[PDB]
Write an enzyme that holds these catalytic residues in place. Structure first.
Site, PDB file in Angstrom:
ATOM      1  N   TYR A  45       0.817  -1.110   0.099  1.00 36.45           N
ATOM      2  CA  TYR A  45      -0.038   0.064  -0.042  1.00 36.45           C
ATOM      3  C   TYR A  45       0.999   1.184   0.182  1.00 36.45           C
ATOM      4  O   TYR A  45       2.108   1.236   0.311  1.00 36.45           O
ATOM      5  CB  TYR A  45      -0.956  -0.020   1.144  1.00 36.45           C
ATOM      6  N   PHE A  55       2.717  10.668   5.245  1.00 41.86           N
ATOM      7  CA  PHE A  55       2.911   9.783   4.125  1.00 41.86           C
ATOM      8  C   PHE A  55       3.241   8.607   4.790  1.00 41.86           C
ATOM      9  O   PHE A  55       4.088   8.451   5.614  1.00 41.86           O
ATOM     10  CB  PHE A  55       3.481  10.148   2.931  1.00 41.86           C
ATOM     11  N   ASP A  56       2.959   7.377   4.208  1.00 41.37           N
ATOM     12  CA  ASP A  56       3.223   6.065   4.569  1.00 41.37           C
ATOM     13  C   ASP A  56       2.974   4.854   3.363  1.00 41.37           C
ATOM     14  O   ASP A  56       2.129   4.730   2.836  1.00 41.37           O
ATOM     15  CB  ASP A  56       2.565   5.595   5.800  1.00 41.37           C
ATOM     16  N   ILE A  75      -7.753  -0.302  10.457  1.00 40.85           N
ATOM     17  CA  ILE A  75      -8.983   0.738  10.563  1.00 40.85           C
ATOM     18  C   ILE A  75     -10.218   0.052   9.881  1.00 40.85           C
ATOM     19  O   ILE A  75      -9.767  -0.647   8.873  1.00 40.85           O
ATOM     20  CB  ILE A  75      -8.803   2.160  10.057  1.00 40.85           C
ATOM     21  N   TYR A 101      -9.750   7.203  12.096  1.00 44.37           N
ATOM     22  CA  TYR A 101      -9.401   7.359  13.504  1.00 44.37           C
ATOM     23  C   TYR A 101     -10.436   8.269  14.168  1.00 44.37           C
ATOM     24  O   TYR A 101     -10.217   8.678  15.230  1.00 44.37           O
ATOM     25  CB  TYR A 101      -8.047   7.576  13.562  1.00 44.37           C
ATOM     26  N   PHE A 118      -5.323   5.920   0.507  1.00 43.96           N
ATOM     27  CA  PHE A 118      -4.597   4.804   0.393  1.00 43.96           C
ATOM     28  C   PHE A 118      -4.583   4.295  -1.090  1.00 43.96           C
ATOM     29  O   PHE A 118      -5.909   4.125  -1.504  1.00 43.96           O
ATOM     30  CB  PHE A 118      -4.936   3.794   1.305  1.00 43.96           C
TER      31      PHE A 118
END
Ligand SMILES: COc1cc2cc(c1OC)OCCCOC/C=C/CCOC(=O)[C@@H]1CCCCN1C(=O)[C@H]2C1CCCCC1
Length: 128
Positions: A45, A55-56, A75, A101, A118
């Site tokens: 992802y 960002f991730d 989530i 969240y 995402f």
């Protein structure tokens, strides 16, 4: 950007039809089979706030991201969205705070009331 595209043209995949999780398929997977609750799931992802400000990526950590579907190790939106995908599919999700969240957020990474974007690839899923 991609987040706007998902607002414009994304499918509402919530039960309640509250547009709290929106999806575009960007690359089609294979099979009819999609994961059931409790399946072991493997993805790449990339994620951000819709603000763009944090960002991730799975890539960042070398290797795939692995979780049990519908066991809230993620989530609620991921439990919902991933469950609609096929092995090999890549999809885009736009998520409202309620399927992410919430008003408490998750500081410092996530602020109160944050929308999340995402991109998700489903690599594989195995049965418990
Ligand atoms: C709020 O905490 C984080 C959120 C997210 C990434 C995080 C978080 O620090 C623990 O660290 C980098 C990856 C660590 O990986 C295991 C943890 C998953 C935590 C649960 O996260 C989730 O359920 C979702 C979905 C699965 C991928 C991670 N995701 C996130 O929301 C990301 C988030 C995405 C938007 C930009 C900031 C990081």
């Amino acid at each position: 950007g991609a987040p706007a595209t998902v607002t414009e043209q994304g499918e509402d995949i919530t039960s309640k039809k509250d547009r709290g999780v929106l999806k575009i398929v960007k690359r089609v997977g294979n099979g009819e089979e999609t994961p059931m609750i409790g399946d072991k799931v493997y993805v790449h992802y990339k994620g951000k706030l819709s603000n763009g400000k944090k960002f991730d990526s799975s890539h960042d950590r070398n290797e795939p991201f692995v979780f049990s579907l519908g066991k809230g190790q993620v989530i609620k939106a991921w439990d919902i969205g991933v469950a609609t995908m096929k092995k090999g599919e890549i999809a885009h999700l736009l998520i409202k705070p309620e399927y992410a969240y919430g008003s408490a957020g998750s500081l410092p990474k996530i602020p109160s009331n944050a929308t999340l974007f995402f991109e998700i690839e489903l690599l594989d899923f195995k049965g418990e």
